[PDB]
Ligand binder design. Structure first.
Ligand SMILES: COc1ccccc1-c1ccncc1C(=O)Nc1nnc(OCc2ccc(Cl)cc2)s1
Ligand SMILES: COc1ccccc1-c1ccncc1C(=O)Nc1nnc(OCc2ccc(Cl)cc2)s1
Lengths: 741, 741
């Protein structure tokens, strides 16, 4: 029975699955897919190692709930990078059968309407908003499927509560129409202890497996000795060519057998240092002093807005490199592709890669059990060591955690530890959000229904607050009480529409209302201070640098600075030689200055030099700001603020792509980010109309010029040759202008 | 030879001309059209009575310069009403042959680009801007024809100088490429003395005729005696049924022969009184106390935003009525159509109708020679008395000017007077505008060329200033001087682009620049104070009323009022119980309040009641404000002001149609002004897409409802039946959404 052809499956999807290598399932997937009425709608909650092909069952169930019972489906993923990778994977897997798959990730939204879509690959943040939209204007009948990758995220997380709110709201909808399902829910999780609780909460069937196609050997390293998980010595490591940790010797031993290695370091500078070191030894140890593919990778990295990196330049032409959050998303994807193809053999990465893309390595060396001054998380450790072993290539996979002295204790604790149980995280902001979501959607009106809703949440399954939440929403004019039936107000409806926390929406309302009274239209800084999310921790602000920039602003910026709350007596002044709101204003002013250079098309390296923030932080900030701009635009649209929504309607795109207004029509093309559109705009093409018939060979020449074979790198298309790149550019322009009218 | 078939002419245009009755030309038209090389391009300047078919030669020459030498053409007309009538006339005459004819009048602009057009029926104000646009971005080769109706307007006028600037600029272009024409110029004028001078100035051939198809008998009336033009008694008038002027007796005598009468009064109240009087007598004198078509006219007047008029209600169902500027444009057109069809037999009109549409009456009675406290203009008198006599119906036409005592002297002076010679009207604002127009267009650079240009104007043909104009443009940063070659600046380029006087553009620049620093986005009043043209004399502002409105403004308006300069200590206060800029601000604030109710879709009668300004003044103000809004939008667009042009980009439409934002897509339909779109919007149609397939019979029912056979009145379509009206509405929506993509 274990064969993808025996199971009912489209021929096109079957032949696409044979391309990636999936031709015979495992026993665990069959036992999970044949777990009673799961194929009919009885929700499903299952756990498996990430290397065991967890998502195959989810994709099969989607194809089912989409083909047989034609309806929409949601694929909720934890992060934007993995969500985009899954969106492109599902697109390449489902294009032939005609299932329109599009993504709601970060700032990007599908050009086509959600009604035209058939699968929405969403982040946790945007899937909740999508379901809120479906509930508001009565379309919950379109949804028939919801898939939640990384179900364990529903516990303690900054975006996990939105996951719970996503399901407890759906289940109520299914359990209020009952006065094998109407909306199926399929969840993928890790080896959680209380998975059952989660399975019973969602009524889903529970499937837990521990099968790993490539066996895993986790071990600790103390001095020169290697011990297994159960405090048993397994090997006496002796360095081959070393100049205790012998990290370089371990990497050398891994490399000698024509394999690759993952090296998880606790910081960025540590990754850059511990990739330089192995590069130096691989030169000296291997030169007594594919290439072509590696030179292609170097040239791909060299035609980027930030260009080549000095440490990358020293490391990459030896098989060694580093992959941390400091690099741009393009550089990170290039390095990840190079490692995936075997071109890069040693990858010094941080913990961020552990939860990100699927990047398996033969040996995973975790330098220290102490990550960022704290012991490594058991979930993080499991995520790292689950990458040890490539399916279908390696016979085994090795994880080596390097510990010492006392550190040995934390290492053995990580070796013998297990995942913590899932939580609920639900007065509190999450419960306020949930109460507002149900009341404003009209799904629940009376307080008896309000407690019934809380009887459907994970808190009720794990085993007052709702009254406090209702009181808070009533006292803050989010909700009105009539003979005590609760009805949404205009502010309460606008909060649920623009997907913002009701806690933040109060100050957002105050800030926008103050901005309407006095606005500065002679720059884009006032329209940016409103769409600037916060400071958070996107960078470590240098006070002197800030004051210097401020001393050199146009004769019109400081007008915007003083109209929003910034000062000069406290503007990188007092803090220069050394208040919770003024700090949040200046740290928002600086943040709004950086975005000012992002929408002014300033090169990332120049922004880094003038502001001191690296390019990864700048890109993260611009993505967050674009999301916030979209939310603020919807908030003003639903409040009847036509003179502000009109101003904000373009800044989401101008921040997503970091462009000027002129390119806002060119960047609609998927392959025109901010530099293949500026060089294509200077040559006279200023509209997607002039680019549909743009001379093919002409745009090839233009893309060949202006360099900061497949040197051009495209997000989701990896590397593209100039000719193929601009051919796809003109084809995308043709499709955009042809299917939008 | 005198036959429209013998002349080379399209068969479709010939059969369309036979519809209006034009089947045999006069001798004067043949002698003017065969005046040497006029048919080849030698410009043409000719004079004829307005009843002699002056424009036939112009239309024939256009068809020529359009069919043979395919190129664009301009039809410059003095006013918006006559320009629109001519646009619809030329459209109905030229649709079959395929000559795309569209109008640049007031605020409306063609949906299609000027390149697609073949005839542009423009006002004098907008034709100059069109020619400036053609000269700027090098398209003067498209223009090959320019037709100027009412050439005598080029002298002393508020829009006449723009006419001269229109031609002296063209001639230079033709006479600078010479270092039978490249742009033909055809002018129609009245019996001017210095026509020759104008003919030689434009190099045009001169044709003057005095032929009138219906002979005219002008006479003066003193007491009971009627004297001819040369102080000779012609008839001893005796009233038939009178209760000296015997105006009513004269109207009765005209009516008894089943004819109609035009009665030109010096004011609006006089027209309303002297139509009520003849209505009263036509009831009492004719009732000892077509109908169906007249009841149709009453119902047409009753389904208007202002509804029926009390004086109109008393007068119209007797054949008598009044036509003054106080009425709406729709009411004026309805009354003019009723008089033209013979339904209305006595029309008490003001001097405004004299220069407007072609409305002939058998007898034209001019009550008094003193019009508005001053003697009647000889041009105005000729314009009035040229309407005496319908071609093809009457055998003669009669003009009767009622004078008395001393007034007799001014009456005989008008009888024996003649038209004053044409002037030039060119430091002065016109010469500044002309110098800026040539320099910024790049057509002239050196001061030698600058004096050469002034050697091409009408001043040079009638027989220092240019140096003063250049100095003024240099000292005001409109123009820069290099090694002394004059180049346009950004402000100088923006002034020529947005078609505003350089005198006004300085204060406009200052006002917009001040508005960018602090703007109020929570209402539309700040975006309206910038697009409010001026006070001029559009109304007589009532101070108490203004202060009352101000005492009752939202909690956000007075914010806009104090941000622009308005006060409360001087805001219908001091002037209430009884400074050239503060007067221009408050009179702009009040004007910006009225427009606020126009874009809020307040009914015209409610605006009239709350502000004290009649509906004709309100409509004139809204048209002027829409023109100003378009000019300001272009001015900000060319100055790189993206945050202001975006705000202003919709107010031109919102003021042209007096609508809200929601209807800005519906009013793109030619038959949806502001009340056939609001009632069609409330039923769910909020987009021109929902109206293309809008159920035909459904929109018929919706238009049948909401009444404030052909009751629906459409501008340019006269009266339309509900079924035909909404059928044309859905057809226009289909065309709009089908040909715009
Ligand atoms: C505020 O909404 C944003 C808009 C722009 C960018 C980011 C956000 C955002 C930010 C932070 N968290 C969440 C969101 C979010 O996506 N909320 C959404 N709500 N509705 C959406 O459209 C989906 C949709 C539309 C129509 C139908 Cl019929 C069905 C589904 S997205
Ligand atoms: C400022 O321009 C306004 C815009 C809106 C409404 C009123 C005005 C206005 C107001 C007062 N006086 C004059 C104008 C005026 O029409 N100026 C114009 N200039 N260019 C135009 O377009 C014609 C055109 C366009 C492209 C080509 Cl290739 C050739 C011709 S219109």
């Amino acid at each position: 029975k274990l064969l993808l052809a025996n199971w009912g499956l489209p021929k096109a999807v079957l032949e696409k699955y044979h391309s990636f290598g999936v031709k015979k399932m495992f026993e665990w997937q069959a036992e999970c897919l044949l777990l009673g009425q799961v194929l009919e709608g009885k929700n499903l909650v299952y756990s498996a190692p990430t290397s065991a092909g967890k998502t195959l069952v989810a994709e099969l169930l989607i194809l089912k709930r989409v083909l047989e019972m034609r309806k929409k489906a949601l694929f909720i993923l934890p992060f934007v990078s993995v969500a985009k990778e899954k969106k492109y994977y599902l697109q390449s897997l489902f294009q032939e059968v005609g299932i329109k798959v599009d993504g709601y990730m970060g700032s990007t939204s599908p050009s086509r309407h959600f009604s035209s879509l058939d699968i929405a690959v969403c982040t946790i943040e945007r899937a909740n908003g999508l379901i809120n939209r479906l509930i508001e204007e009565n379309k919950m009948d379109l949804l028939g499927m919801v898939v939640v990758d990384e179900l364990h995220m529903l516990g303690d997380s900054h975006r996990g509560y939105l996951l719970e709110l996503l399901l407890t709201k759906i289940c109520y909808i299914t359990r209020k129409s009952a006065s094998s399902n109407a909306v199926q829910i399929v969840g993928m999780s890790a080896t959680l202890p209380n998975l059952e609780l989660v399975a019973s909460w969602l009524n889903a069937e529970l499937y837990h497996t521990d099968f790993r196609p490539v066996p895993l050997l986790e071990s600790v390293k103390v001095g020169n000795s290697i011990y297994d998980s159960s405090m048993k010595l397994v090997r006496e490591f002796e360095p081959m060519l070393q100049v205790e940790d012998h990290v370089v010797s371990l990497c050398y031993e891994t490399i000698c057998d024509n394999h690759s290695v993952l090296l998880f370091c606790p910081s960025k500078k540590w990754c850059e240092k511990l990739a330089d070191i192995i590069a130096r030894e691989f030169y000296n140890l291997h030169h007594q002093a594919e290439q072509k593919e590696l030179l292609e990778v170097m040239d791909q990295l060299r035609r980027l807005p930030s260009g080549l990196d000095s440490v990358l330049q020293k490391t990459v032409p030896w098989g060694v490199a580093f992959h941390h959050a400091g690099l741009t998303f393009e550089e990170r994807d290039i390095i990840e592709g190079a490692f995936r193809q075997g071109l890069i053999r040693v990858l010094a990465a941080t913990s961020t890669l552990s939860s990100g893309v699927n990047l398996p390595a033969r040996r995973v060396i975790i330098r220290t059990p102490i990550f960022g001054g704290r012991p490594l998380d058991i979930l993080t450790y499991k995520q790292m060591v689950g990458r040890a072993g490539r399916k279908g290539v390696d016979t085994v996979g090795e994880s080596i955690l390097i510990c010492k002295n006392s550190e040995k204790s934390k290492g053995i604790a990580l070796l013998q530890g297990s995942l913590k149980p899932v939580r609920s995280c639900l007065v509190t902001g999450s419960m306020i959000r949930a109460i507002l979501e149900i009341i404003v959607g009209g799904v629940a009106s009376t307080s008896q229904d309000m407690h019934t809703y809380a009887a459907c949440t994970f808190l009720a399954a794990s085993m007052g607050a709702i009254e406090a939440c209702v009181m808070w929403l009533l006292e803050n004019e989010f909700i009105q009480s009539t003979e005590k039936v609760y009805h949404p107000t205009h502010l309460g409806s606008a909060t649920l529409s623009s997907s913002l926390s009701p806690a933040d929406t109060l100050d957002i309302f105050a800030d926008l209302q103050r901005a309407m009274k006095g606005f500065v239209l002679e720059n884009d800084l006032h329209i940016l201070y409103l769409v600037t999310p916060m400071f958070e921790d996107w960078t470590t602000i240098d006070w002197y640098r800030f004051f210097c920039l401020w001393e050199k602003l146009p004769t019109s910026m400081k007008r915007v600075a003083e109209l929003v709350g910034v000062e000069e007596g406290f503007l990188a002044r007092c803090v220069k030689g050394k208040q919770h709101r003024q700090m949040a204003i200046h740290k928002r002013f600086f943040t709004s200055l950086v975005l000012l250079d992002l929408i002014s098309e300033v090169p990332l390296r120049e922004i880094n030099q003038k502001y001191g923030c690296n390019r990864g932080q700048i890109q993260s900030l611009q993505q967050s700001a674009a999301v916030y701009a979209g939310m603020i635009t919807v908030f003003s649209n639903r409040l009847g603020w036509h003179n502000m929504e009109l101003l904000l309607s373009q800044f989401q795109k101008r921040l997503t792509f970091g462009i000027q207004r002129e390119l806002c029509d060119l960047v609609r093309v998927s392959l025109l980010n901010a530099q293949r559109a500026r060089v294509l705009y200077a040559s006279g093409f200023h509209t997607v109309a002039d680019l549909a018939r743009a001379n093919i060979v002409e745009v090839e020449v233009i893309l060949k010029n202006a360099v900061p074979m497949r040197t051009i790198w495209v997000t989701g298309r990896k590397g593209l040759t100039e000719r193929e790149a601009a051919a796809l550019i003109v084809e995308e322009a043709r499709m955009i202008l042809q299917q939008d009218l």
